[model samples]
Target chain A: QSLANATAAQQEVLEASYAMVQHIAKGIRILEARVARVEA
Target chain B: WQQWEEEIEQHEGNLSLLLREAALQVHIAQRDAR
Candidate 1:
């Protein structure tokens, strides 16, 4: 419910948070897609 | 700024591209499939 994730990066985290989330999400999707195709 | 609502209001092509790239990882067919 609450966002307790910013504790580590209190000040500058806000600015980086957007891109950071974007990067991680993007990376995960890309990796999963790769494994799927390799099997086929 | 990053948009929180429907993408119709705000568009982030760069972010979208990043997402598509991620999808490609899981769906390698996404490459030639596209």
Candidate 2:
């Protein structure tokens, strides 16, 4: 629910990292998505 | 008591990182999210 402060550059990296996770999660909501990916 | 150490563990996308990314900066324009 909270976090320590971060500089602008660090914040960008953090945001980018979260976006990557979210994108993967969204694409994996259905079983079909899993069938498409070898890791799934 | 000697001391206490908190070793946080998570899925790497917890609210912590998101909150840090939402904080204010010196010169960057505010592009905050909800």
Candidate 3:
């Protein structure tokens, strides 16, 4: 397609990747709290 | 024309690596919780 289409696709990919990173970070935080509680 | 395709592939590769790392950390945490 056009460059504009490609740009839009790239932006979508980047946004999805960022969302996944945020989700993973949140999961890590929850796991950290659980581990802390177990150790405590 | 295909520059965007290459860039997107690279970006996805990096994301895959990041996900793998996150999965490993989660696995370790689960093990520790056991």
Among all candidates shown, the one with the greatest lDDT: 3
DockQ of each: 0.03, 0.07, 0.03
Instruction: Single out the weakest 10-residue window by summed lDDT for candidate 2 chain B.
Output: B1-10
> Where does model 1 exceed 4 Å of error?
A1-12, B1-34
Once fitted onto the true fold, the runs of candidate 2 whose alpha carbons sit more than 4 angstroms away are: A1-6, A32-40, B1-22, B25-34
Ranking by TM-score: 3, 2, 1
Find the 10 residues in a row with the least total lDDT in model 3 chain B.
Answer: B1-10
Order of quality (DockQ): 2, 3, 1
| Pick by TM-score: 2 or 3, better one | 3
Alpha-carbon shift of residue B12 in model 3 (angstroms): 11
- Summarize candidate 2's per-residue lDDT along B1-34 as a digit string, tens digits: 0121122124443565545646444123433421
Q: What shift in Å separates residue B31 of candidate 3 from its native position after superposition?
A: 49
Stretches > 4 Å off in candidate 3 = B1-34
DockQ-wise, the better of 2 and 3 is: 2
* Model 1 lDDT per residue over B1-34, tens place: 1233245224446555655564444344333334
Against the true chain A, what TM-score does chain A of candidate 2 give? 0.49
| Clash pairs, model 1 backbone | A29-B22, A30-B22, A30-B25, A32-B26, A33-B25, A33-B26, A33-B27, A34-B25, A34-B26
lDDT of 1 by residue, A1-40 (tens): 0222233234235336656866776676677679778978
